[PDB]
Amino acid sequence: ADNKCENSLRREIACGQCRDKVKTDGYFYECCTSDSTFKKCQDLLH
């Protein structure tokens, strides 16, 4: 898929945080193109 975050600044800023917390390389690029993966990240930030 394409980089959704590239179009949504919020999605980019959000993934950036989880990328560090989750401590998983590629996570940022994964959640950016993964609606399901965002669910988990949404819980952590919550």
Side-chain angles (χ1 to χ4, degrees):
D2 315 74
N3 209 353
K4 305 298 95 117
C5 305
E6 187 189 280
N7 281 38
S8 160
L9 75 90
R10 269 199 157 73
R11 195 80 163 196
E12 204 205 310
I13 302 161
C15 269
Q17 295 200 28
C18 270
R19 171 183 145 285
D20 190 78
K21 301 285 161 208
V22 184
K23 284 296 194 181
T24 300
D25 314 304
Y27 190 85
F28 172 90
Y29 173 77
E30 176 179 55
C31 58
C32 270
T33 69
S34 299
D35 276 336
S36 282
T37 307
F38 200 66
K39 294 210 86 272
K40 288 83 160 163
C41 173
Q42 274 204 93
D43 197 2
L44 310 184
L45 297 179
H46 274 185

